[PDB]
RNA sequence: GGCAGAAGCUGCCUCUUCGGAGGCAGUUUCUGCC
């Protein structure tokens, strides 16, 4: 074996200890301001990479793989100090996840609702925040969303997670379920 | 040739009145968009 499920996920947090990786940026300066980036590049340490790969019909992380080879040629680092202890801690990844020989367009309410908006020539719903609460012994997120004439609500730990809990209602409020 | 959104996986950042909260991105599988 020579690859994993993610490879940009390696580059992405080494930036915390190297202060030069994860510098993803545009590849042009005479068109991207119009509406969309339409090509991307990355710089890491003393090197640089681009999304092209062999043809991009291979992966969507050729940009990072082309610069992750420089993370193997790094200095001793005379700045941003670190440690590497052993025989004192142990860890293991999760084993609950699974795979399938097939896929679908409605695996969960959350993806399903987001996927339906694009088929209507939209992008996303009209999400909103309420959080009209703050008791001496109770605090929580309270999301609101609108889709035309109706609304749903949900709970979470940030504005990228309360979207999950509300989506179970988002199909039943407007009659998609 | 090429990008953005959602979920699953990965991990980071800050606050706490001691209930707990607030904030991010990446990838990959679906979709749409270039």
Swiss-Prot record:
Tissue specificity note: Widely expressed. Expressed in brain, pancreas, heart, skeletal muscles, liver, lung, kidney and placenta.
Subcellular location: Cytoplasm; Rough endoplasmic reticulum
TM annotation in the entry: none
Modified-residue entries (Phosphoserine), positions: 100
Domain DRBM: 6-73, 108-176
Top-rank taxon: Eukaryota
Domain comment, as recorded: One of the DRDB could be involved in RER binding. The C-terminal contains the tubulin binding domain (TBD).
Task of the protein: Binds double-stranded RNA (regardless of the sequence) and tubulin. May play a role in specific positioning of mRNAs at given sites in the cell by cross-linking cytoskeletal and RNA components, and in stimulating their translation at the site.
Self-association and partners: Binds tubulin. Binds with low affinity single-stranded RNA or DNA homopolymers. Interacts with CASC3 in an RNA-dependent manner. Identified in a mRNP complex, at least composed of DHX9, DDX3X, ELAVL1, HNRNPU, IGF2BP1, ILF3, PABPC1, PCBP2, PTBP2, STAU1, STAU2, SYNCRIP and YBX1. (Microbial infection) Interacts with HERV-K rec and gag proteins.
Name of the protein: Double-stranded RNA-binding protein Staufen homolog 1
Source organism: Homo sapiens
Name of encoding gene: STAU1
Whole-protein coverage range: 183 to 355 of 577
């Amino acid at each position: 074996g020579s690859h994993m499920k993610s490879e940009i996920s390696q580059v992405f947090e080494i930036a915390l200890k190297r202060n030069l990786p994860v510098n993803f940026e545009v590849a042009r300066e005479s068109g991207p301001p119009h509406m969309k980036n339409f090509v991307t590049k990355v710089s890491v340490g003393e090197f640089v990479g681009e999304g092209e790969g062999k043809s991009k019909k291979i992966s969507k992380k050729n940009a990072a793989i082309a610069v992750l080879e420089e993370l193997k040629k790094l200095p001793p680092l005379p700045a941003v100090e670190r440690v590497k202890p052993r025989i004192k801690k142990k860890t293991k990844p999760i084993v609950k996840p699974q795979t399938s020989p097939e896929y679908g367009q409605g695996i969960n309410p959350i993806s399903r609702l987001a996927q339906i908006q694009q088929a209507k020539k939209e992008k996303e719903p009209e999400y909103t925040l309420l959080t009209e609460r703050g008791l001496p012994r109770r605090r929580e997120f309270v999301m609101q969303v609108k889709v035309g004439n109706h609304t749903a609500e949900g709970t979470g730990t940030n504005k990228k997670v309360a979207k999950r809990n509300a989506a179970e209602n988002m199909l039943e409020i407007l009659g998609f379920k």
